[PDB]
């Protein structure tokens, strides 16, 4: 379960999700990666869920990289209560992802192995995804 | 990084520069003493007197008094009378003082 | 300015040895003592008696200079220490008054101490200076036993122009600084 160790501020405004990803758009560690096609707040539950799925898939072996981190506090007012009287409470953390952002990477596992594992992972994520291979373009970046 | 030397310099010089008067600056080497008068608006020395240039000698303080007096002569001639005294990094005392005291009775208004 | 013993040994014996040992070109390159600072880090007189002046009269006695106070920079609770409390003495010996203290130290003080077996070699600054600690202070000759209330140490620091410990090691060893190892 990801979440900041410490926090300058406890509640955080929502914001929009303009544009493509700010950066973190090229593979930087492994051979294959999962890329976001549409933007979302990726929950800490989902990150972890994908993580476990890959781990489980190639039981003992390879290394998983995680290029996204939930630092945004997600708020929710209680059930059946009305508007006003303060902001809701923190109820979890999300990571803001945008198209182009590589979210996971794997390495040291066979090509076929990587493909299935990253594929299953995407199924856990609330967005459309694509797998990619490390390119001359990536190493150039 | 800064020596207390430099800090004093800025500190006393800036204060005087704000009053907008002409500036009587002073250098006090181990062997000589020099005194020039500056228009900081234009950035220009109007008149200057010194020990080296005076080809002067005979005990530092008594010498210093004269270069002041001599400074007033060339100053008053040009029209300068109103002036402010840049005492530099040096305590107003002894040699610097004597330069002021001379330049005073020499005719300078300060 | 004043003819004294140790200054003669430096200028007539220590100097040349140093030159032939490191081959100094220019004269001022030759390492020399700059100053000696004594510091009784008391604070035993913190809230306590202003009878640090007893340690101060004892101090001025040894050095021939009046000692200055040092007071608390920051307050520390664990030490029962209020920012501004008088907690030490410091006196800076330069020129001839330095030379006299060092002469009586190398000759009379340092031997008269309990089980002297040499100064610590490793205690060099790293950039040419040297530091040591005394615990007695009757060890200085001009302090008879009757003048003392309780014991009191002090922090001696000796400062040289030496670029490094080697040069510093030599300047001190040659003056009469006995080293342990």
């Amino acid at each position: 379960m990801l979440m900041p160790r410490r926090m300058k501020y406890r509640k955080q405004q929502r914001g929009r999700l303009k544009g493509a990803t700010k950066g973190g758009d090229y593979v930087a560690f492994g051979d294959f990666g999962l890329v976001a096609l549409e933007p979302a707040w990726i929950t800490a539950q989902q990150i972890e869920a994908a993580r476990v799925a890959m781990v489980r898939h190639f039981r003992r072996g390879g290394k998983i990289f995680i290029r996204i981190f939930p630092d945004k506090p997600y708020t929710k007012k209680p059930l059946e209560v009305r508007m006003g009287k303060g902001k809701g409470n923190v109820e979890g953390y999300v990571a803001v992802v945008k198209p182009g952002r590589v979210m996971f990477e794997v390495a040291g596992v066979t090509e076929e192995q990587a493909m299935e594992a990253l594929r299953i992972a995407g199924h856990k994520l609330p967005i459309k995804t694509k797998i990619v291979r490390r390119d001359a373009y990536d190493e150039a970046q | 990084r800064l020596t207390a030397y430099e800090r004093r310099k800025f500190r006393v010089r800036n204060r005087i520069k704000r009053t907008g008067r002409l500036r009587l600056s002073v250098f006090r080497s181990l062997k000589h003493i020099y005194a020039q008068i500056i228009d900081d608006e234009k950035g220009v020395t109007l008149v200057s007197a010194s020990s080296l240039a005076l080809k002067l000698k005979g005990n530092k303080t008594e010498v210093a008094r004269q270069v002041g007096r001599a400074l007033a002569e060339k100053a008053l001639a040009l029209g300068i009378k109103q002036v402010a005294f840049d005492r530099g990094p040096y305590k107003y005392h002894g040699r610097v003082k004597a330069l002021a005291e001379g330049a005073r009775e020499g005719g300078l208004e300060f | 300015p004043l003819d004294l013993a140790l200054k003669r040994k430096y200028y007539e014996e220590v100097r040349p040895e140093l030159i032939r040992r490191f081959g100094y070109q220019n004269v001022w390159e030759v390492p020399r003592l700059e100053k000696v600072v004594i510091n009784q880090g008391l604070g035993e007189a913190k809230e306590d008696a202003r009878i640090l002046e007893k340690a101060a009269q004892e101090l001025a006695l040894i050095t021939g200079q009046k000692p200055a106070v040092t007071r608390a920079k920051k307050s520390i609770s664990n030490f029962k220490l209020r920012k501004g409390m008088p907690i030490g003495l410091r006196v800076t010996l330069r020129r001839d008054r330095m030379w006299i203290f060092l002469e009586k130290l190398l000759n009379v003080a340092l031997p008269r101490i309990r089980d002297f077996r040499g100064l610590n070699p490793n205690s060099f600054d790293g950039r040419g200076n040297y530091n040591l600690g005394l615990r007695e202070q009757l060890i200085f000759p001009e302090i008879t036993y009757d003048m003392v209330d309780a014991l009191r140490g002090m922090d001696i620091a000796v400062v040289t122009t030496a670029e490094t410990d080697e040069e510093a090691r030599a300047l001190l060893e040659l003056l009469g600084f006995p080293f342990r190892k």
């Binding site: 059946e80 209560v81 006003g84 009287k85 303060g86 | - | -």
Partner: protein, 84 residues
């Protein structure tokens, strides 16, 4: 029916707006006394013919024209060139 155990708000205040900023610009004609800059600290420094008040307010000392200057590390200055 509806209005259940809601809550409260431990904060929810602010101070009055203080209308700070530059009040006369480069090239603007000004009377002696005119306020040139309202500020906190010397975000600007007083220059030629410009004085500074106890709360760092910059005002003109002469009738003239306002002029700005960035002297890099020495800060920024507001001047007033007098007019002939």
């Amino acid at each position: 029916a509806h209005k259940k155990g809601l809550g409260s708000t431990r904060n929810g205040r602010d101070s009055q707006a203080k209308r700070l900023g530059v009040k006369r610009y480069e090239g603007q004609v000004v009377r002696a006394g005119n306020i040139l800059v309202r500020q906190r600290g010397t975000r600007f420094k007083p220059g030629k013919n410009v004085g500074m008040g106890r709360d760092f307010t910059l005002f003109a000392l002469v009738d003239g024209v306002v002029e700005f200057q960035d002297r890099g590390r020495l800060g920024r200055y507001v001047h007033v060139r007098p007019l002939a």
